[PDB]
Design a protein around this ligand. Sequence first.
Ligand SMILES: [Mn+2]
Ligand SMILES: [Mn+2]
Ligand SMILES: [Mn+2]
Ligand SMILES: [Mn+2]
Ligand SMILES: [Mn+2]
Ligand SMILES: [Mn+2]
Lengths: 289, 289, 289
Amino acid sequence: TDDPRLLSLFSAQREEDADIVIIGFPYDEGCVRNGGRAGAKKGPAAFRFFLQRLGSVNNLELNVDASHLKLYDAGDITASTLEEAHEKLESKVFTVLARGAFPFVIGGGNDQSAPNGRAMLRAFPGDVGVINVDSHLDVRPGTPFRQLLEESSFSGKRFVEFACQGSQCGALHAQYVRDHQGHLMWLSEVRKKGAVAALEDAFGLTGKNTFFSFDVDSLKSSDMPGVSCPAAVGLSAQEAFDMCFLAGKTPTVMMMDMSELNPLVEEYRSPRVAVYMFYHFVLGFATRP
Amino acid sequence: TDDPRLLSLFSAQREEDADIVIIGFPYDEGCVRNGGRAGAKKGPAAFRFFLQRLGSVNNLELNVDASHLKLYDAGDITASTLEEAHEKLESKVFTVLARGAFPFVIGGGNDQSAPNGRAMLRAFPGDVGVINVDSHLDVRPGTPFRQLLEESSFSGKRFVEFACQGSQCGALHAQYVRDHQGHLMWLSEVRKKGAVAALEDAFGLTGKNTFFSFDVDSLKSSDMPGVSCPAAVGLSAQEAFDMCFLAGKTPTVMMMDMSELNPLVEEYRSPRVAVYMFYHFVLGFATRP
Amino acid sequence: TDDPRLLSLFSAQREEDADIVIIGFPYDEGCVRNGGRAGAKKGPAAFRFFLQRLGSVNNLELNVDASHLKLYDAGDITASTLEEAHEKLESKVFTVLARGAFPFVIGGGNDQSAPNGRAMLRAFPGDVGVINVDSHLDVRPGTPFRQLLEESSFSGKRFVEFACQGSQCGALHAQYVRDHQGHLMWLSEVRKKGAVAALEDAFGLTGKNTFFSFDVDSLKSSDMPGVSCPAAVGLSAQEAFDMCFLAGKTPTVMMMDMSELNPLVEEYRSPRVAVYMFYHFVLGFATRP
Ligand SMILES: [Mn+2]
Ligand SMILES: [Mn+2]
Ligand SMILES: [Mn+2]
Ligand SMILES: [Mn+2]
Ligand SMILES: [Mn+2]
Ligand SMILES: [Mn+2]
């Protein structure tokens, strides 16, 4: 038609021909256990629904044409047990990374990020950086970033907790991260600096081979109500878009996941924001040398 | 009582005695066809409900007393066919314009703006300007602003697309407008300048006899969820109010319409925002020499 | 556990051992009569639900540890008539004030603030200040702040209407307050100065023995939908949190109430904001000398 969108970029005959490979992980586990709502397992389907519909490939506002990129949907990870599921997810993400392609994983709960981080650690031995964009720390004794901070080959100096909220983070949890030389960038600090500026600082710390992990409950619930654990304050939709674009254009960002989208909580506005976030990553990615 | 509101301004015996005449257009057609939801036809009723209830006529915050203005509700345009409806709407708006009064048209979908623009072109031959405040371009091969850009007597140099969004606008659509010498003012640009400042610039371009056309899906859905095509990002409610006040006080603005209000999507918060927008236009209008 | 929250502060054996005493007032009366929705009577229960769940006692973002404070829930005021209820509320708040402890009253509608103000006037004869944080004036011929402005011992020079909205305030109502030497700080003015800066100015006017009265319909409905009279524009959640923290740390603030929380309108996001507001007051209070 006269307005080609993301759907039009799925021109890859086979997965191997794609720049960016989408992988779904339809499992609840994550913030639901921290008082949250069940339903994140429906995130990949809701994301797909709007993936079919949104995102002008040539954006004349940002002046970026993403026409040359090829996307591929590898479908959902399927398994009879959550443990097998985690294993299959890790293995899949690794194979995509190993051939130099970019895996984007749509969840599903936070727990997906542990297998995703492990694929990273395997693919770039001893040279991974990780940012967790999250209103929560996700480090309770398990939580995905405690699992990764406990990895021998991962340097905590290259771990950033981004847009975390003091009202939602235990002293013991902050202490654990900092004792591992990790960095806390509180919401107030991100707001003060500007979200993109602060994320630039974050990527400076994470360095090469960065896992950009985006828990969407880091967004204020006024923009992003449909998450397992809705935030009273947090990132705006525009800040999220702007951050996603930066991550897209930053050559050191080697994979992304997106956790906690929960259509049982809210099913129309929130999945659209999620797709628009991915869309901005795709535009940024289009500008990579 | 001790707090006179908009309702109190409906003191006109007959329509001819009114400064501002309200006309309803209860038809869905507009963004519903671009993936949107049916229900905009219920906008005029929902608008009326809160019209009866809101808006202090003497506003001590802005220090504007709208007591001297007379409003009149001419009711809804009724017809057995959408085509006849468009014809009747155009004819009605024209008669209001022709006697020097101000028509405000509450929709209803975007399609209303084509008949509204035509009434303008008839009333001010070869000397009309038009601004479309819209997250979308509304120019697909039909869409109301393609119809008006195809009018012989309309100069595209005096057409502004205001607060449009790059994620939602085809390259072919931008190209069409610009090839007609029309102007795109992207949301990011409006945000950067300030909404009122940018609208001042817009009115500078539209010039005399300006049609101020406000598609409310230009507002972020956090403030304005009840529209056929809810926006993830967009104008805030305050920006919309501030813009409406400016339009009210700008003597070159000769009519206004308001499209896409959809109470089937959300029925309480959004119609209130719509009435408050009209209310701010009325305060601004009160200050016209 | 590894993340102690507000619940952990309820260590007071008996009420007398508490720094802050929570009192519930489960009655609708307030903005419901100004076109609002019934249901504020459910506010205290909804507030309690999230009180059990939220708020890190040691906040590493703000670097305030509220561990030393003792909270106590005195339950709800119960009575066979609204009039008796008002009497019991006043009496209870007074006894808490009289022994130097801090009463926090969760409503329930605006009408609670009249008995609350009276307890203040009794406890600090002729030396009370009052701020009403409210999108509305609450002064109609009755409304709680007309009742207090009519008190012989109360100086209107020490009454501030904060974040009021011109679109929602009659000229006669503004006139009444100003004729009593009261001060109007319009939303636009609060926004221009910064919310905390403006509240500092307000506390400068209210002076000693200030009643901090927070009608949550002063918050924009994008953040705070669950109120009897939802606001199109207003304070953000962050502004409210920031204001509550300031009030907590300001030694002249001797009690607080919180009115208009309405879970019938919206039951999850809004009570969380209410608890987070109280939470910020508690952190601020923790820093009092
Ligand atoms: Mn998380
Ligand atoms: Mn989270
Ligand atoms: Mn439109
Ligand atoms: Mn539109
Ligand atoms: Mn009130
Ligand atoms: Mn109020």
